[PDB]
Amino acid sequence: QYSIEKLKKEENSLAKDYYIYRLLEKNKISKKDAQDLNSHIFRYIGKIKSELEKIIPLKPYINPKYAKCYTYTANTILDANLTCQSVRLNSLVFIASLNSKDRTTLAQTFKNQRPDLTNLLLAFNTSDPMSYIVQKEDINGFFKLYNYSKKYDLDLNTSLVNKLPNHIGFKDFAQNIIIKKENPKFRHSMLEINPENVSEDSAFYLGVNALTYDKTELAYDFFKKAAQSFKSQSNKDNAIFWMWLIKNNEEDLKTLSQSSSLNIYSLYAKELTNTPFPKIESLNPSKKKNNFNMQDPFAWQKINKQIRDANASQLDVLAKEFDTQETLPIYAYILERKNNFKKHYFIMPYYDNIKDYNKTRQALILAIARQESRFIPTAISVSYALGMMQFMPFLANHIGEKELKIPNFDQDFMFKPEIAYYFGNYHLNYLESRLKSPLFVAYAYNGGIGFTNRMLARNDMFKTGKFEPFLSMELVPYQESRIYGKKVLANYIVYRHLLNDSIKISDIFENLI
Ligand SMILES: CC(=O)N[C@H]1[C@H](OC[C@H]2CCC(=O)N2)O[C@H](CO)[C@@H](O)[C@@H]1O
Ligand SMILES: CC(=O)N[C@H]1[C@H](OC[C@H]2CCC(=O)N2)O[C@H](CO)[C@@H](O)[C@@H]1O
């Protein structure tokens, strides 16, 4: 427990944020203590911001140069000077609120200097502003209208759709409409995007899009462009896997099987080609401990910052300092940076707490902890999930107080490895009993069993099909859970291998359908 006075002495960090949030939620921050407090908050977002704003609303913040502009309304905007008129017309809701005669007037006013404003004003004088903006091929207007309302939907011709990728909004547009299976005319139109005009994630999602319309040759061309342009080897491998699945070129599979990235795709390719399992590093420090406190959340925030700012030389000093059994998770974390992310570290710390579970359970626990925290006992997420297994306070308290009735339980007990692994086992029993597959369990661990149940109830998810279950894995509608599932599944395969309880990843894939 930390008073606001003592917290204010600590460096700004997620740990300090968490402990400030704990005071706010227990009503221990007075209006007077609240006055300076946002200079003490490292990430002023979500619940900490809503809680603080209940004590001290934000009057902030309109830019003082344009103050006067915000004194007009739709009824008086024709009395405003030209700068004021153009500032207020940045808002499409403001434009929508205008009467049509004033939209006509303002459109004429702005036609020479701001034809973008003209196009939007006249668009809103029609019953379908999107159709007007599309006829003009006003790309900036298109994205403004999309951000205003996701309900507009229209066919887009080859020329227009090939202009969209140059706008910063394209990537989120494409991803959202493909994954959410919305805006079907937009989605169908995006089949005519030239792969030459897209790259990376956008190219990849356009591949996925093409597969949903069974346009396999277009899909291949998008995935090939993605494989060529993606920065990360793990993403390139995902793209190459699709190239292989669609066109069956055995050079694509061979390239995938020789990847330096360990991921589900490279593991699968290795299995299909009878390639040996990738080499896993063995870390076995003989030193037992050092002076570092693995149970101090503030100390972790500080050493993490140091490690991530350390030059090649400082990483070697830190490596030596943390080369002990007690600080093994910090050691592996340092080595991962020091070796430029080329070696595979799959540690098993605090193993005494799980050695009596069966090996398949051990592997799933380890797989989850590796992705959740990298085994850092005092890990804290941006949403204040806690410890090695990244329990949200709600769940920690439900399990620790309601279910297990641990005397004097506090959510900070999640920072103790014994508790993290015990609670993790407890919750994984609940999930696995309902879902079975380690991939589904992973999705429910990160995203909730409600989300997972709803996804699996759909007719179009994890059912039989030409490109299943891989296609479904690309369409998991929450990006954090989609990524999380792929990573945890790879880790699970590795840990099962390391525990002498190997499973073929092909058997996992068969059990998904
Ligand atoms: C400490 C923390 O923020 N962990 C989050 C993790 O972060 C991934 C990387 C970066 C930091 C780390 O330990 N692993 O991503 C998971 C989703 O994939 C989340 O559920 C976890 O809460
Ligand atoms: C381990 C845990 O607390 N999981 C919960 C998750 O926590 C969000 C982040 C933290 C770490 C992670 O993997 N997901 O939030 C879901 C949505 O509210 C809940 O349904 C889950 O039970």
Q: What is the 3-state secondary structure (H, E, C) of 228-297?
A: HHCCCHHHHHHHHHHHHHHHCCHHHHHHHHCCCCCCHHHHHHHHHCCCCCCCCCCCCCCCCCCCCCCCCH
Ligand nearest 442 Cα, by number? 2
Atom of ligand 2 nearest to the CA of 368: 13
Pocket test for ligand 1, best of 42, 234, 373 (most atoms within 8 A of CB): 373
As a whole number of Å, the end-to-end CA separation of the chain is: 48
**E strand or H helix at 166:** none
What residue owns the CA closest to ligand 1's atom 2?
381
Report long-range pairs for 479-483 (Cβ below 8 Å, ≥24 apart).
479/175, 479/179, 480/446, 480/447, 481/443, 481/446, 481/447, 481/451
Cα 475 to Cα 176: distance, rounded to the nearest angstrom: 11
In 3D space, the residue among 452, 458, 451, 421 whose CA is nearest the CA of residue 439 turns out to be: 452
| CA 386-392-393 angle, 5° bins | 90
Q: Method used for this model?
A: X-ray
The ligand 1 atom nearest the CA atom of 383: 22
The Å distance, Cα 81 to ligand 2 centre, comes to 51
* Alpha carbon distance 156, 190 (integer Å): 8
Nearest 5°: phi and psi at 380? -135, 125
Report residues whose beta carbon is within 6 angstroms of any ligand 2 atom.
372, 381, 385, 390-392, 395, 445-446, 448
Question: Atom 21 of ligand 2 has which residue's CA nearest to it?
Answer: 448
For residue 223, which amino acid is it?
F
Which atom of ligand 2 sits closest to the CA of residue 396?
3
| Structural contact between residues 377 and 295, judged by C-beta atoms closer than 8 angstroms | yes
Burial class (CB in 10 A: 0-12, 13-18, 19+), 277: middle
Dihedral angle sign, alpha carbons of residues 67, 71, 75, 80: negative
Our mutation pick for probing the ligand 1 site, out of 308, 381, 389, 487, counting the most ligand atoms within 8 A of Cβ, is 381
Encoding tokens for residue 244? 């292989």
CA of 356 to the centre of ligand 2 (A): 26
**Residue 483: nearest ligand to its CA?**
1
Minimal-distance CA residue to ligand 1 atom 14: 373
Q: Which atom of ligand 2 is nearest to the CA of 385?
A: 10
Ligand 2 atom closest to Cα of 450? 20
**380 forms bridges with which residues in the sheet?**
386
3-state secondary structure of 116: helix
280 Cα: distance to centroid of ligand 1 (angstroms)? 22
State the closest ligand 2 atom to the C-alpha of 394, by its place in the atom list counted from 1. 3
